[PDB]
Design an enzyme around this catalytic site. Sequence first.
Site, PDB file in Angstrom:
ATOM      1  N   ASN A  90      -2.075  -2.528  38.827  1.00  8.59           N
ATOM      2  CA  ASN A  90      -3.332  -2.232  38.186  1.00  8.59           C
ATOM      3  C   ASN A  90      -3.275  -0.991  37.285  1.00  8.59           C
ATOM      4  OD1 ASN A  90      -5.911  -1.614  37.378  1.00  8.59           O
ATOM      5  ND2 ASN A  90      -6.652  -1.374  39.505  1.00  8.59           N
ATOM      6  N   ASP A 189      -4.513  -3.867  33.401  1.00  8.48           N
ATOM      7  CA  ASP A 189      -4.538  -4.365  34.765  1.00  8.48           C
ATOM      8  C   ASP A 189      -4.302  -5.889  34.737  1.00  8.48           C
ATOM      9  OD1 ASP A 189      -5.018  -5.142  37.349  1.00  8.48           O
ATOM     10  OD2 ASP A 189      -7.217  -4.789  37.208  1.00  8.48           O
ATOM     11  N   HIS A 345      -8.879 -12.767  29.709  1.00 10.28           N
ATOM     12  CA  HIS A 345      -7.449 -12.509  29.510  1.00 10.28           C
ATOM     13  C   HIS A 345      -6.813 -13.806  29.088  1.00 10.28           C
ATOM     14  CE1 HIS A 345      -5.968  -8.535  30.433  1.00 10.28           C
ATOM     15  NE2 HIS A 345      -6.802  -8.475  31.482  1.00 10.28           N
ATOM     16  N   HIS A 379      -7.496  -6.969  26.954  1.00 12.29           N
ATOM     17  CA  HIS A 379      -7.853  -5.740  26.252  1.00 12.29           C
ATOM     18  C   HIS A 379      -6.835  -5.632  25.122  1.00 12.29           C
ATOM     19  CE1 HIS A 379     -10.550  -4.491  29.510  1.00 12.29           C
ATOM     20  NE2 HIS A 379      -9.565  -4.676  30.378  1.00 12.29           N
ATOM     21  N   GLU A 404      -4.377   0.835  26.082  1.00 15.85           N
ATOM     22  CA  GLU A 404      -4.807   1.157  27.448  1.00 15.85           C
ATOM     23  C   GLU A 404      -3.788   2.123  28.074  1.00 15.85           C
ATOM     24  OE1 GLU A 404      -6.499  -1.519  30.348  1.00 15.85           O
ATOM     25  OE2 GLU A 404      -6.521   0.022  31.921  1.00 15.85           O
ATOM     26  N   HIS A 406      -4.498   3.806  31.086  1.00 19.45           N
ATOM     27  CA  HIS A 406      -5.114   4.035  32.396  1.00 19.45           C
ATOM     28  C   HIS A 406      -4.348   4.951  33.350  1.00 19.45           C
ATOM     29  CE1 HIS A 406      -8.192   1.939  35.417  1.00 19.45           C
ATOM     30  NE2 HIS A 406      -8.122   3.266  35.601  1.00 19.45           N
ATOM     31  N   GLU A 449      -9.851   1.921  28.998  1.00 17.26           N
ATOM     32  CA  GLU A 449      -9.376   2.931  29.940  1.00 17.26           C
ATOM     33  C   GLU A 449      -8.233   3.790  29.422  1.00 17.26           C
ATOM     34  OE1 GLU A 449      -8.989  -0.322  32.997  1.00 17.26           O
ATOM     35  OE2 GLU A 449     -10.720   0.775  33.901  1.00 17.26           O
ATOM     36  N   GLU A 525     -18.163  -4.159  31.272  1.00 13.49           N
ATOM     37  CA  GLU A 525     -17.709  -4.847  32.480  1.00 13.49           C
ATOM     38  C   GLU A 525     -18.744  -4.716  33.532  1.00 13.49           C
ATOM     39  OE1 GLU A 525     -14.046  -2.378  32.580  1.00 13.49           O
ATOM     40  OE2 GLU A 525     -13.382  -4.044  33.894  1.00 13.49           O
ATOM     41  N   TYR A 526     -19.002  -5.845  34.225  1.00  9.50           N
ATOM     42  CA  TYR A 526     -19.992  -5.800  35.318  1.00  9.50           C
ATOM     43  C   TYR A 526     -19.784  -6.977  36.234  1.00  9.50           C
ATOM     44  CZ  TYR A 526     -23.472  -9.385  33.615  1.00  9.50           C
ATOM     45  OH  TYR A 526     -24.075 -10.571  33.238  1.00  9.50           O
ATOM     46  N   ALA A 527     -20.457  -6.938  37.434  1.00  7.37           N
ATOM     47  CA  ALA A 527     -20.419  -8.036  38.407  1.00  7.37           C
ATOM     48  C   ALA A 527     -19.003  -8.581  38.563  1.00  7.37           C
ATOM     49  CB  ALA A 527     -21.294  -9.211  37.944  1.00  7.37           C
ATOM     50  N   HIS A 528     -18.157  -7.717  39.145  1.00  7.61           N
ATOM     51  CA  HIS A 528     -16.737  -7.921  39.466  1.00  7.61           C
ATOM     52  C   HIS A 528     -16.598  -9.172  40.368  1.00  7.61           C
ATOM     53  CE1 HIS A 528     -12.721  -6.767  40.946  1.00  7.61           C
ATOM     54  NE2 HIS A 528     -12.563  -6.636  39.623  1.00  7.61           N
ATOM     55  N   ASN A 585       2.845  -2.997  43.834  1.00  6.40           N
ATOM     56  CA  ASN A 585       1.953  -4.005  43.244  1.00  6.40           C
ATOM     57  C   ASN A 585       0.571  -3.803  43.817  1.00  6.40           C
ATOM     58  OD1 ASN A 585       1.380  -5.999  45.534  1.00  6.40           O
ATOM     59  ND2 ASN A 585       3.648  -5.663  45.591  1.00  6.40           N
ATOM     60  N   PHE A 589      -5.659  -7.934  43.520  1.00  9.50           N
ATOM     61  CA  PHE A 589      -6.532  -7.296  42.549  1.00  9.50           C
ATOM     62  C   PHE A 589      -6.580  -7.959  41.175  1.00  9.50           C
ATOM     63  CE2 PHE A 589      -8.606  -3.899  40.189  1.00  9.50           C
ATOM     64  CZ  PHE A 589      -9.808  -3.989  40.894  1.00  9.50           C
ATOM     65  N   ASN A 592     -10.030 -11.840  39.810  1.00  7.66           N
ATOM     66  CA  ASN A 592     -11.403 -11.378  39.746  1.00  7.66           C
ATOM     67  C   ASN A 592     -12.251 -12.352  38.980  1.00  7.66           C
ATOM     68  OD1 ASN A 592      -9.745  -8.271  38.629  1.00  7.66           O
ATOM     69  ND2 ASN A 592     -10.058  -9.043  40.696  1.00  7.66           N
ATOM     70  N   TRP A 987     -14.646  -2.043  44.931  1.00  5.59           N
ATOM     71  CA  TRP A 987     -13.801  -1.016  45.463  1.00  5.59           C
ATOM     72  C   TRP A 987     -14.599   0.105  46.038  1.00  5.59           C
ATOM     73  CZ3 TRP A 987     -13.439  -3.077  40.573  1.00  5.59           C
ATOM     74  CH2 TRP A 987     -14.078  -2.329  39.562  1.00  5.59           C
TER      75      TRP A 987
HETATM   76  C1  LIG Z   1     -12.385  -3.037  34.248  1.00 10.62           C
HETATM   77  O1  LIG Z   1     -12.100  -3.123  35.630  1.00 10.62           O
HETATM   78  C2  LIG Z   1     -11.350  -4.329  36.011  1.00 10.62           C
HETATM   79  C3  LIG Z   1     -11.126  -4.264  37.534  1.00 10.62           C
HETATM   80  O2  LIG Z   1     -10.636  -5.507  38.115  1.00 10.62           O
HETATM   81  C4  LIG Z   1      -9.996  -4.429  35.234  1.00 10.62           C
HETATM   82  O3  LIG Z   1      -9.019  -3.409  35.608  1.00 10.62           O
HETATM   83  C5  LIG Z   1     -10.319  -4.221  33.774  1.00 10.62           C
HETATM   84  O4  LIG Z   1      -9.135  -4.378  32.993  1.00 10.62           O
HETATM   85  C6  LIG Z   1     -11.030  -2.878  33.595  1.00 10.62           C
HETATM   86  F1  LIG Z   1     -11.156  -2.613  32.219  1.00 10.62           F
HETATM   87 MG   LIG Z   2      -7.230  -0.462  33.767  1.00 11.22          MG
HETATM   88 NA    NA Z   3      -8.317  -6.467  38.424  1.00 12.40          NA
END
Ligand SMILES: *[C@H]1O[C@H](CO)[C@H](O)[C@H](O)[C@H]1F
Ligand SMILES: [Mg+2]
Ligand code: NA
Lengths: 1011, 204
Positions: A90, A189, A345, A379, A404, A406, A449, A525-528, A585, A589, A592, A987
């Site tokens: 991630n 990620d 993605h 991304h 990115e 991150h 990120e 980003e919302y509602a994972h 790893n 994760f 999603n 999380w």
């Molecule tokens: C927003 O959060 C999600 C978490 O699963 C991913 O890491 C995305 O790439 C991040 F931008």
């Molecule tokens: Mg990230």
């Molecule tokens: Na993820």
Amino acid sequence: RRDWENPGVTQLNRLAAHPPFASWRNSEEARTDRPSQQLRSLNGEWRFAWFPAPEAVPESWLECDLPEADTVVVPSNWQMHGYDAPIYTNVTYPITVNPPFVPTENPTGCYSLTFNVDESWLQEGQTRIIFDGVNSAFHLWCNGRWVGYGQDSRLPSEFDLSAFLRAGENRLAVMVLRWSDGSYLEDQDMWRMSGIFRDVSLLHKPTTQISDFHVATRFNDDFSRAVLEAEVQMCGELRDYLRVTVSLWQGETQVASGTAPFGGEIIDERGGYADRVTLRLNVENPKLWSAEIPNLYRAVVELHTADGTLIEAEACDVGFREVRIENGLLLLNGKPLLIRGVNRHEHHPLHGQVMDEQTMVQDILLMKQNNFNAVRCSHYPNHPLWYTLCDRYGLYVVDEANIETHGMVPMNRLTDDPRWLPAMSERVTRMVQRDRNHPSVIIWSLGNESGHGANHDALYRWIKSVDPSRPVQYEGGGADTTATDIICPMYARVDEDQPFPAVPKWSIKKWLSLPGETRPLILCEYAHAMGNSLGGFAKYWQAFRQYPRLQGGFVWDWVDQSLIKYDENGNPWSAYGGDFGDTPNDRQFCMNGLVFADRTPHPALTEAKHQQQFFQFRLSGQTIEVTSEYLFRHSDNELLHWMVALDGKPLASGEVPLDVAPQGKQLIELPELPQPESAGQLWLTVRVVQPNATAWSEAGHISAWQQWRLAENLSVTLPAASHAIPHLTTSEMDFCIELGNKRWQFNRQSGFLSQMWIGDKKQLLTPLRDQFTRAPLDNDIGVSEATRIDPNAWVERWKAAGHYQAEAALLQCTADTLADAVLITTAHAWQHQGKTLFISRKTYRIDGSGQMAITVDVEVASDTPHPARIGLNCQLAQVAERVNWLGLGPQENYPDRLTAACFDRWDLPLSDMYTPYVFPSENGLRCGTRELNYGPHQWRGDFQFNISRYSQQQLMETSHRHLLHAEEGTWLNIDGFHMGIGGDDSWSPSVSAEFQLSAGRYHYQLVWCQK
Amino acid sequence: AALLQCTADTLADAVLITTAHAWQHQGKTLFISRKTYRIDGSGQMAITVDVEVASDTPHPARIGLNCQLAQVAERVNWLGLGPQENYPDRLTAACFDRWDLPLSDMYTPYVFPSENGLRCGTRELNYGPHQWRGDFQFNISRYSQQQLMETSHRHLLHAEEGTWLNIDGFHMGIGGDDSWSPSVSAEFQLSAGRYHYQLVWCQK
Ligand SMILES: *[C@H]1O[C@H](CO)[C@H](O)[C@H](O)[C@H]1F
Ligand SMILES: [Mg+2]
Ligand code: NA
Ligand SMILES: [Mg+2]
Ligand code: NA
Ligand code: NA
Ligand code: NA
């Protein structure tokens, strides 16, 4: 040189970026988007060999095929062919952080291809090769000779092979490095892979040519008039006779056309651009482009001679539309959007990161049928076809630079460094340069990120400057920095603040009105959507609908990133993080999504579809008010169907054509509804149906629904005294009750209904016992590992408190006889290390009818973490083919994820009662059930339940679905109460308070019997 | 009230009375109440109540029981929220503890008379030799709801014989965002459709 460890070097000999070209030599071909002969694919069968480092590459390779090489398909990701492992991490970079250096052991893939070039191509003009996607960096040779180098895995790298080709057979050598300094800008990620994953092709251009073109559509105040402005740029020798003709077509109809020789207006003291020209085409009543009606025109750009002779033609699809932010609102064609978006993605469970048109198309169609209108390229720029399809089917797009970082500490370590500005700049500039003509692209994104640094401000400014047509957004550094036109947070909650230092995440409603704030807000980003999630989705929708400035968001995310692996048997299984030997790893994760990797929906998809509905209803009496959330189209392919049922019994239905204008209302008077002979609740259900098929849906597609309770008539009828009375057989160890062919046994040691017999058949494999836990959802878990815990996770809190470990301590078990029944009474305590967590008091009443009525009253200690559930469970001896129930359905539903479900009578094959989340957990619950039927059994009350061949313990103990094994018989979990599942994020604790089992005291009553 | 059932059973250590009633209006069943009264050799009467509310009837004001006690005692002592009047949507200020006041403080002399004096989150209530246990809300005064409802000026109220006790398993919010349109928030409306409560009545 080690160009791959130097951010100052992102390419060698690369041509300039430009929009999609094809160099047609026939204008009508161009017009019609037919295939162009001047553009050819080198996709197919390539030669490939894997080395542990570039230094392990043999010289001969440039020269000739390595015997040992293998025939592989291109494009592809080498990990997808078994050369090395794909890695799932991630945040943490898959390589040591130490820019701009990479590991000496840097997996290298030697691709080569022998192909033919025709003389025609070499006699005249220009021949270049285009590699759409090379991950992460590469060196190129042609016929033995070095051509160039290039970085950024998500944009095309192009080179002039003109001077390198021979007529006949030629040889390409492509040395692809897994890791480069570019990798420091590619910390998304997702699975970490590599190779030649996008198309490879040859394009022939004339020497005098169209080297660039920009399309602008400006309008008047009411969109009744527009000007199409097209800037054209050339390369080659300038001549007075050269000309450009730009023409616009609405189908087969030529809408406008204009011609001019080269030479732009004066720009400054030194003049203008002799090698450029702008054409301006007026258009009256243009057909506007939107996700709603993806009206498109065709633009043909012709480079020719004054006498009519064609040099070349280029062209593109044109959508007339205006995007702009005004008085804090995101407007499209002057109307404020409501973003029903999803992040997506480029992921194939088989092909890896290689995308194909069918999958794209399949994705779009699924999105649209699910009431999605927008997508974010999380991304990085996508494969070129993506945009075309978005242009065509109609989806608002967020185009995102491939940046990115991150895993840096702090996150802006590089983005705030001027020495990284350059590499970063290319990732932004080349994207705009490439996609600036797609109508579907409505917003530019600076990446993801990478904190917030000066580099972002500079680039933000660059775009604004070069393409004022679209807003730029960026969430890094706090979601509302000076590098964003849109407040675009990730996971900010609706009402709940998360005041992290430096980068708080405020409640969205609160964010909008903070002192001096005026921007619109759309969540990036919302509602994972990880596993059993989407609890609280409705809360967002309500809020978006209520506050003008809350203009939606992009759910995270569309498809699970599982990869297919096979077992000895040769059978396929969905894999995740670490399943390839990858480590470190991030395990699951990477899953999603709203849909599984094969595009099968997760149950959450339906919740997403309902909440994103484009028609809203309200009921008053017998009158229904339909409201349209469409901005542009009328409801012209829609009919409303409705139906009235009593307890699942259909009593009356009908249709009504819908005729609502964008944003209008329509009232629908329901015809007098007859009276039901019968107690119970009447339920009204309405669905909006599409009678005609579209480009994205088939005839009869259901686009929206809603239900309401009409009148209810409580039952006041007396059971009816029964002939016979049940018999109580006491015993040292047990209370037995017999009644005809039926026997019930209560183990007095335990206090639980140990067994039941119908005739001579035992009914239970396992006793009926209280249950307060559930196999943890991904949301329950959070980041809670082994290496590191995370105390706050629900799962941790439960573990720690003893929930999973508590065993029952009998406190009472008695039996009494009533006039017409036997009464078993029990009391149990659940303790842990001396703490009584819960207390269960119950009564069982078996009567002359042979119905056992169970009354439950549970007490929950206030200082113990709120339980996952409050119900009972048992293992039935039977295994039936179907499940039939009167309740919410048909799909899986939980308390904070139940709006899409409908109250009716459902019947499915038992299998449909289990949800195959790749990482197993409590799943398949159905809420608000008044009646459940299985086998000979019938349960009635008002509860939630799940039923399957897998116990809670197995679920919780199995990491992969493929490993589950159907147990003997059937596991039934019937709950008086069930805790919400959450999902605002995965999380941290995300289950809203109203969905937590905090009452302290709960009562429920079930009636069990045989039908 | 329409009696649907009424019976008696004898237990090991007790007598059990089971009842069921239907509340109707103009042929409409508004509510259903189902109870059991369980008196044991210990003198404790345990009342268990389960009610059904027609989904299409307006959410009721309260779901409880009431009766006029013969007795008039000087104080009221309770284990719950207080000491002052507190309602569901107006109880943050109150504290949970042991309260003991003169009967009169249990009445709120609003000039325009109405339901008043309620105390929520009570686990124990003692009046005279009576004592009630469970988890409820209650009010107690020398005034019936009917009187309260028929009298428009507090000065016109008159103490009735005995004490009226209103014990609720459930009580609707009182509201007040405004006093001229319904103002009770949805979370404070008795709309669940099925209600359950239980109390222990005994002596001391
Ligand atoms: C927003 O959060 C999600 C978490 O699963 C991913 O890491 C995305 O790439 C991040 F931008
Ligand atoms: Mg990230
Ligand atoms: Na993820
Ligand atoms: Mg470099
Ligand atoms: Na809004
Ligand atoms: Na599991
Ligand atoms: Na009054």
